[PDB]
């Protein structure tokens, strides 16, 4: 029953703070190069690695103020909190490819409504 | 998909812990605990951000074990059916596409990809060719999928894709 | 009731009693020409 | 003794089995009812008179044991109870 | 705004008394100086003389609430 693509998520999820590839990637690496220091204190594991490694490869906007700017123009519209973090990630062309993208956008908004804000995502990139 | 929410967890202390450090010795212990780990009501927990508070630790009656109750805010990688995350290709085999979701690899198989996707094995690096090439999905390459099925193999999570589609993965 | 109804298909395959099996006793050729992955087709001279 | 025999089908043949298990996912092959998924509750043998509970229809309704057909959606948890590869997982 | 009784009641006394002789019996640092002892229950009694036990009694009241105090707060009886 679980389907984020019908937008619905158990009580105690639903209620969960969404997260970005680059904002993952800035406090692992915070976490990180806090670790490093301070001697005698056991270093990071292979989960650590290999998500680093992972969320390295997909830093759209390594500039926290880019983030903070881009998460305050998406958050003024009235879309879900899972409709933030999978658009914001994935960064596609126009608004016919993210209606394709999220069934739940089929119908939900403009094409040029959802068209100026890919241009302004793209724009906003690094 | 990671999200950063407070759970809480109990943690006994031997009295050998007592000390100065003791506040610091829970925070090692929580540490130490809640990282990397999976259970089948929040997911794979990745790493604790913060601690809010530690509890006040209730000696135990005929046990020198004090537990504390502390609750910390972390962040947890749970994937649900129907999400599409990015990932990098691991290898080709014939007998499918490896990935990898983060803390997670995925698979996809042959009869999901497209009847144009055959095969290459006598090539040193294998890789699915959509018939007439125009697009490489071999190792060291951003894909995306969307998860259709997860699975949980005790604390270790493995969902399944498919691929017949173009604008979300390679383009 | 056929017996595939009934019997469990490990047992089905390991006795040999699938359409496939069918198949590969009555057609001609050897066995493991027909259970080669890639089929066994004709060739002229030129290739 | 002659009383209290009642051979089988096997029998018959020398001289169809049901693994509907609960919290299951099993469609509607043949009838008017068709393409309608629903989750099994009862287990019986011939006549199951199964009562799924399909989606946008909060009653239940009943189909026999033959009316049935194990479905799941691509990419779910699935247990084989008899086949070649019989206790495995994927 | 605590209104239970200022006192150790024995019950309070002999239970932190043996609580703590059992910690200090599981290796655990002490709170005083050592003359040259090495029972845990004398270790415990000296302890609870010099008001130094790291212990704070949770008294439940008949309503639910409860009221934490501390050995080195409240006044002891013996």
């Known amino acids: 029953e679980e389907d984020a693509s019908q937008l619905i998520f158990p009580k105690e999820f639903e209620t969960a703070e969404t997260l970005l590839n680059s904002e993952v990637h800035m406090l692992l690496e915070h976490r990180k190069q806090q670790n490093e220091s301070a001697e005698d204190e056991q270093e990071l594991s292979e989960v650590f690695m290999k998500t680093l490694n992972y969320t390295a490869r997909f830093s759209r906007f390594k500039n926290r103020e880019t983030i903070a700017s881009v998460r305050s123009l998406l958050l003024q519209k009235k879309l879900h909190k899972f409709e933030l973090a999978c658009l914001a990630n994935l960064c596609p062309e126009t608004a016919e490819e993210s209606k394709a993208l999220i069934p739940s956008l089929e119908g939900r908004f403009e094409d040029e409504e959802l068209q100026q804000i890919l241009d302004d995502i793209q724009t906003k990139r690094s | 998909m990671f999200y950063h929410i407070s759970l809480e967890h109990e943690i006994l202390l031997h009295p050998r812990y007592f000390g100065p450090n003791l506040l610091n010795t829970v925070k090692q212990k929580l540490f130490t605990e809640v990282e990397g780990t999976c259970t089948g009501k929040y997911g794979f927990v990745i790493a604790v951000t913060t601690i809010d508070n530690i509890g006040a630790g209730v000696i135990q009656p005929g046990r020198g074990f004090v537990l504390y109750p502390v609750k910390y805010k972390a962040i947890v990688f749970r994937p649900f059916k129907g999400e599409v995350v990015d990932a990098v290709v691991t290898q080709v085999n014939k007998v499918g596409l490896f990935t990898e979701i983060g803390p997670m690899s995925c698979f996809i198989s042959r009869h999901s990809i497209p009847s144009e996707m055959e095969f290459d094995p006598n090539s040193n690096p294998p890789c699915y060719k959509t018939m007439d090439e125009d697009i490489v999905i071999q190792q060291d390459d951003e894909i995306r999928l969307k998860i259709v099925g997860t699975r949980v193999d005790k604390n270790d999570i493995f969902a399944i894709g498919s691929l017949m589609d173009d604008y979300l993965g390679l383009v | ?47 | 003794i002659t009383e209290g025999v009642k051979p089988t089908l096997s029998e018959l043949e020398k001289f169809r089995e049901h693994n509907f298990q609960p919290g299951d996912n099993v469609e509607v092959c043949e009838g008017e009812l068709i393409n309608l998924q629903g989750k099994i509750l009862s287990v019986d043998g011939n006549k199951i008179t199964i009562m799924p509970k399909h989606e946008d229809l909060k009653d239940m309704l009943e189909f026999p044991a033959q009316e049935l057909r194990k479905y799941f959606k691509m990419g779910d948890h699935v247990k084989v109870i008899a086949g070649r590869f019989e206790g495995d997982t994927g | 705004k605590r209104i239970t009784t200022p006192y150790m009641t024995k019950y309070e006394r002999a239970r932190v008394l043996g609580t703590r002789a059992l910690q200090i019996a599981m290796c655990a640092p002490v709170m005083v100086e050592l003359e040259g002892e090495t029972d845990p229950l004398l270790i415990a009694m000296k302890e609870l003389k010099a008001r130094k036990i790291p212990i704070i009694i949770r008294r439940y009241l008949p309503d639910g609430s409860y009221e934490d105090w501390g050995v080195d707060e409240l006044i002891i009886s013996d």
């Open chain 3, 1 to 47: 009731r056929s017996i595939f109804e009934m019997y469990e298909p490990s047992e089905l395959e390991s006795s040999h009693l699938t359409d496939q099996d069918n198949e590969i006793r009555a057609t001609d050729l050897p066995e493991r020409f027909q259970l080669r992955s890639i089929p066994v087709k004709g060739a002229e001279d030129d290739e």
